[PDB]
Amino acid sequence: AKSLRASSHLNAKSVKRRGVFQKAVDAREQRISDKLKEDLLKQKLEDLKKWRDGRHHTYKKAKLMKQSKKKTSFTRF
Amino acid sequence: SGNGAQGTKFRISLGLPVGAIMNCADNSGARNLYIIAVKGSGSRLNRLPAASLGDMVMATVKKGKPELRKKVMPAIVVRQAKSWRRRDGVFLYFEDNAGVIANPKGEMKGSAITGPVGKECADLWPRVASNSGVVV
Amino acid sequence: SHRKYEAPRHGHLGFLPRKRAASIRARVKAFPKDDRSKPVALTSFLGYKAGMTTIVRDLDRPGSKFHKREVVEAVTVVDTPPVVVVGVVGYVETPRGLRSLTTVWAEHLSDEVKRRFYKNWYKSKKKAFTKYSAKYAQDGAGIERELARIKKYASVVRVLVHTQIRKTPLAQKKAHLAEIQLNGGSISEKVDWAREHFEKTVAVDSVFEQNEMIDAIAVTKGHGFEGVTHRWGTKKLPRKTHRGLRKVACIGAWHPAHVMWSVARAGQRGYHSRTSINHKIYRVGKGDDEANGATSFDRTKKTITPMGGFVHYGEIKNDFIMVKGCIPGNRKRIVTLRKSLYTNTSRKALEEVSLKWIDTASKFGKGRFQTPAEKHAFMGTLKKDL
Amino acid sequence: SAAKEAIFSKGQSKRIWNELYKVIDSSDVVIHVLDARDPLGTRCKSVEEYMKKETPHKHLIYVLNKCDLVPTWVAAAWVKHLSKERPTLAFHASITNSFGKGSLIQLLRQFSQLHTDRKQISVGFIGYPNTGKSSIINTLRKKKVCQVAPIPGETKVWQYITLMKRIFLIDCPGIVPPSSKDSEEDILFRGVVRVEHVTHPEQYIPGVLKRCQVKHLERTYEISGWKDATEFIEILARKQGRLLKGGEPDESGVSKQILNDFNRGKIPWFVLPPEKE
RNA sequence: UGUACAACGGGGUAUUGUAAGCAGUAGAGUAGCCUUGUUGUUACGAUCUGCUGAGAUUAAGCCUUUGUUGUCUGAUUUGU
RNA sequence: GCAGUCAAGCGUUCAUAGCGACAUUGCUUUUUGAUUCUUCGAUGUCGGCUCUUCCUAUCAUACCGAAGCAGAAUUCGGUAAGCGUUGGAUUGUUCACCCACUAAUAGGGAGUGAGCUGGGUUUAGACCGUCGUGAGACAGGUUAGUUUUACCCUACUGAUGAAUGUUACCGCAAUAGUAAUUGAACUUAGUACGAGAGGAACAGUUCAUUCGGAUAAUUGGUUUUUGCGGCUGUCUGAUCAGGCAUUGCCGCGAAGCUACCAUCCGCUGGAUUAUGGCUGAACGCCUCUAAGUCAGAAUCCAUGCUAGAACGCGGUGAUUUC
RNA sequence: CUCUUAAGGUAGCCAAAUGGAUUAACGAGAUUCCCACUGUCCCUAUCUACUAUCUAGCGAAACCACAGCCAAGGGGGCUUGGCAGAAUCAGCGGGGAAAGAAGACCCUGUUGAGCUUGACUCUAGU
RNA sequence: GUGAACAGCCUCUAGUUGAUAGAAUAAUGUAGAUAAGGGAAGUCGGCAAAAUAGAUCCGUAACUUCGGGAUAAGGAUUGGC
RNA sequence: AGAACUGGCGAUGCGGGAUGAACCGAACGUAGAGUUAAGGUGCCGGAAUACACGCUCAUCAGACACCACAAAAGGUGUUAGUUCAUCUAGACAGCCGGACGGUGGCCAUGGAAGUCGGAAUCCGCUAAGGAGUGUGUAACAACUCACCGGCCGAAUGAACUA
RNA sequence: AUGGUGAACUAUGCCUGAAUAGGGUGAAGCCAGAGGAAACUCUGGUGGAGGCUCGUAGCGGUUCUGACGUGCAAAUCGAUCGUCGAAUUUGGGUAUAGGGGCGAAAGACUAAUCGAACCAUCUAGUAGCUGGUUCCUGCCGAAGUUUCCCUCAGGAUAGCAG
């Protein structure tokens, strides 16, 4: 009966989202974030056991001069 | 599911297409049933309506008591020779595929069933479970 | 003349063209919606599909017919050693779409990534990032400039990770590099996190955890040129039909005087990129932990490695992700595991998974034993023994 | 209860009835062929009343075919009782050993004499499928002119047969009228039904035991002492070796054979004519 | 020029179903032989039993490898 | 349809000279659901197998409006083509009709005339019927009866690819495609509603149908693993170990391939239609509409998913030493 | 001118055993049905050989106005649009003055020749 | 040699090893097989395949021109020693 | 459909109608210049996004032929008209008030009082008020309009045509 | 039409040669046994008949959504099938020759030719008809209709251009 795109069932889903489901998502995420912090701490703890530049400037200037010299510019003529 | 069926029925491998003779497990006097139709089947183009354990069919009594033949009564498949899966994983099959005569509301015409009855059919049909001396 | 009996289309028109995927590693075309209030997290991961095995699960699904009953499930084991961050990419939001603004790499890159940048690694001088490490020497002025640029302008930050493929049983030494988007935290927090991580690894349990639904994005198994009867499921024509019976019979009408794009034709099957979503994580294993494959109902003290290893894949010496059901892609294949793009509202996404048993019997035959110890104790002593 | 088989509707087909109405529209004299075994069963009254209303000038005649399968007194009683309504004529159709051929020739020749103003006279034959209209035409014309087959429904169209320069015979597909007063059990025992397609022919056998006499049925098949039809079939099948693979009798097939013997005049049966008057 | 790769080998892991050879009284019985006797005995004899879940196969698109032996080399082209 | 009638109007000059909408009346098988259970010349060969798309004149599913619509069900109507629309029986075939299943078994277009096929156009054989003096031809009926791309172009399905310094990696997204579907089960409940018989639904849950996309843990299938074992016949003197039997045959058989014969997975935001409204003129009442505006369908457009412009683009790495 | 067709209650009368053709046997004859059996199908899958495929050698043919992307119009070329990027490989069988019959069923000339007949003119024979 | 056999299969004498080859093992084909459960529901039509099959023994119907039908049908067996 | 005539095409290009047997224009050698026809002048496209008076908004406008069809009508779209009617003895729209008396007229019946019905349908008092226009009641009650009147203040209504 | 040439293919007659495993059935005759007086009837054998049967070689050509379809082949290949002791199959010799022969009659066959073989000539047979019909320019330039042969056809006249 009621389709996937059904407004009624989607609205029941949306009411349900904000309850137990988003709670469980956010709590799960907090736990995984703490595990990541543990992981980085362990790794740093084993660690203690021991323009942009001239390249990009010439690159861009050449590219723009080639586009102006072959008449192939999106932005200028 | 059907009329008189208790709750949902999960997928089991279809064993009994239309035109399949199946034994009559009950004591209603029929000796075999001939599936002419299957309840609940979808409309796929060349697909024969097929029946499995726990499914209600429409069957004619082909051999047996003359008071029962030439008539089309509903039947409920209680055994099956096609191996199907039980969720506590085991694929199982019976030695014959058989059914019982039921009125469309689920009641058994017979007063007993002989031989084993699958639990997927006993569970789904209370009047089958209540008439089956051997389950699984 | 109208179609006499209405039948639905064979196949899906949204999975077209059924061509070979442009790369073996399937792209992630969408990442979960960024929520800056949450802390910084990785939205995907990279692992290798090791194989499949059997699980008994103590199902707690209220309202079900299998409620409070053990149910046997097939699962897929994805070998997931930790991936290590090597770079950042900042994306600006432009009226023609997202745009990579800049990319900052770690100071030291392993051989595994550097191999990814050559077709002929053995012949090379291995000069991969030699003029780029020097940008860290001059107190990191260029590195800091591009990171400040990401902070100033980027509206999407993606980290660049890669797999420690040497930890897998694979023969391939060329690691797999990818962009993983960082969700949570502001742009500056994303960049600072990533800078702090430029040579540290990220374990799989720092991205996913048990009882989470994840997406599997992988290029499927390839089958070569395959005909209509099985590329699309078209019915076989009657026996000994002239010109053959494994082909579609009529192709077109008197008009449009062409074969339509919708008519099923033969061609490449498989090796297509697919995104399969909502795969429940049944176990996030730990590499160092022996008894990976043991549970609280099964005390055998065994790892998830079947006897004889997996078939066409070695042992599981690493962290692994065991997901319910089957996954696109075959064994040995890089898969991308993604966080779910939406807060799923099914009750399956909420269930805690309670395994009773993992099938570590051999996949190289009709394996009947879980451990070599069990096989020995069932056989008895042989003639190799006295 | 099961569906009505398509084989008990045969003869009610619209093409057959169109063919009959052509035969009637084109005939001056209409012969209604009757089976002497059960004439009243094989009498199509609806066509008779249609002709009495719509075509009073066309002449119905009864011809009591298969007249050699009843006793002489039964044939005589039936002609006595049907002549009170319609001029009937006893007849046994056989190209070599007929009876009533001369009488029918004389009657048709008189019918032509009455219509001397109309210089061709067409005589159409009417009845159930298996009564013998083609066999009567072949008898009169004195060779295998129309197609003759015991399985009913052979001829599908009418055909003109030129008996004489003045007289034409028209064979017709046999009809069965759809009046519900006749059972669908009865539409089988009149030779109308191809018994091959009868789905459960084991049920009509007590009907045969009703129609036939035990004294004759013990003799047509050399078997005796059946308590019931359902075991009459099995004792006959064991006698004839019609046992399927595994020791069980070919019960449906033997029933089909018994019904075929009944309708094709291998078993002696008739319904007794009405009482003396 | 190496936790390299390869060809073999070892170990698992899987498939079959108990190898070749020898022995045995185990054996339907039939011949012969005398100690003419109850495992009489010498020979044949399908088969049976013991060595023997033995023997074979096992990546060719299985896993692993403290072993052995060898290889690491040519050709072509590409510049803002 | 024919024959009337009336007359809004028309002609007009005369409204009786005539036309003439709507409305209506006579004719059609007997007023008490019986029959009228009832058939009557298609000079027609088209029709099924596979497969695609479109139409809306909507059968179902979605949402509405009107009904003595209590409930349940139904009827009539509106928007609506997103998505489905069956298995058989039957006869020249097809519809019909029949049986059943189904949510429903809607109606059509382009159809598939030498993609494949059945009857018919079916040519020389033959038989019967009718006619003709005849040769013969027909009111017929029955039977048997070779037909052959593409290797060309284009379309379509997949696969490479030259050069825009070279080379490598990581991405963007114009455009184009798009997908999910239906049923019933627990609970809401034996509640609302009801004399009673009966008896919903939303919210919360669980499965399944059809489709689709994958996958091979398991189960099943398959076996040139000719992997292992056996069997027949013969040949290598016997044992061994083997050959041959157009893969010899039989049993088991890993791996691989594979099956609703196995398993997993398939969503959520905007804007609307009918309709229901708000404020409010037109028009000193009123009015959902004119200005403005709220909600609202399986719709649309996006999200998500597939491809990636081979002449769309970005970021980044290395750029040849004698 | 007259007038004609109404015998009994489950097998009769009978004709120098039968009263039949409802004929055995036979049949690559036409048709229906049943059992058995099966991939005919549900609903497809897998395997083997040879192809196809790639290479070395050898090397045709049909066909051919020129070409070869679509839509609407015009009672492929012209009109108006959609567009359009080298060179290509395997499939495919929608379309192609693209070939393969344009055959078959039709129409017409004063158009042969086979056959018939109290059509005409003749004639062997008799 | 097997076997009833000048059948099929294997071999001795004699003859031949000639038919363009090599490498892969996609779809579709040609030829040949196997397939769970059901068993004609497929089809215009059980087409094609399957099933049967040698020999011994038991047994064998209607009908009949008395000759047949008839290998009717339906059963029980088969090795080695 | 028949007759009679006259034109066009055949044998014939060219300009225009996007296109073209039947339409509009047009006296065909090779050119140059000017001017035009029919058709046009936003851009494709040579030529005014000219001037001017109105009308029209179409949830698939029209650009188009017209004593052509679907075509006779339907519309609380808009515009211009025609005829008739009402109006400082107060118009249209609003509120407010009266809306009476015989009388609950007769018949009917469980009831029927203007309003289930059948027939009458008159009189009085009036500024006006039906033996009642509808909602209503079991009947009444009440409300309502049609009809008057009070307040307001100046135009309005109806049918038709384009 | 005239005159010739073919029975090496094939049709049929004749003369002279040749070829055809293994099985099933079990006819007459005969033998023994028992019945009956006898004709003879029953049982057990023997025997080995048949335009009999299964089935090789052989001869044929049924069926297949068979293979092939510029093929190996202008009729093959594969499997399946009919028959297989004779009205059989077959070599050579010999006879029949075209308005003929020969035919278990299908117009079947008569050298890939048959609704009348093949070859040459008369013969360049006959056309209502189809296709084609070869250089340039200048100038003039139609008709597509009347009237009669009953009419169609086929034609003769007027009309237009000269």
Ligand SMILES: Nc1nc2c(ncn2[C@@H]2O[C@H](COP(=O)(O)OP(=O)(O)O)[C@@H](O)[C@H]2O)c(=O)[nH]1
């Ligand atoms: N015994 C008998 N049988 C007859 C007679 N007439 C016809 N039949 C049978 O009827 C069968 C065929 O019937 P048919 O003539 O085709 O019936 P129709 O279609 O009415 O002419 C034939 O086999 C005859 O044996 C008769 O007079 N006596």
Ligand SMILES: [Mg+2]
């Ligand atoms: Mg007949």
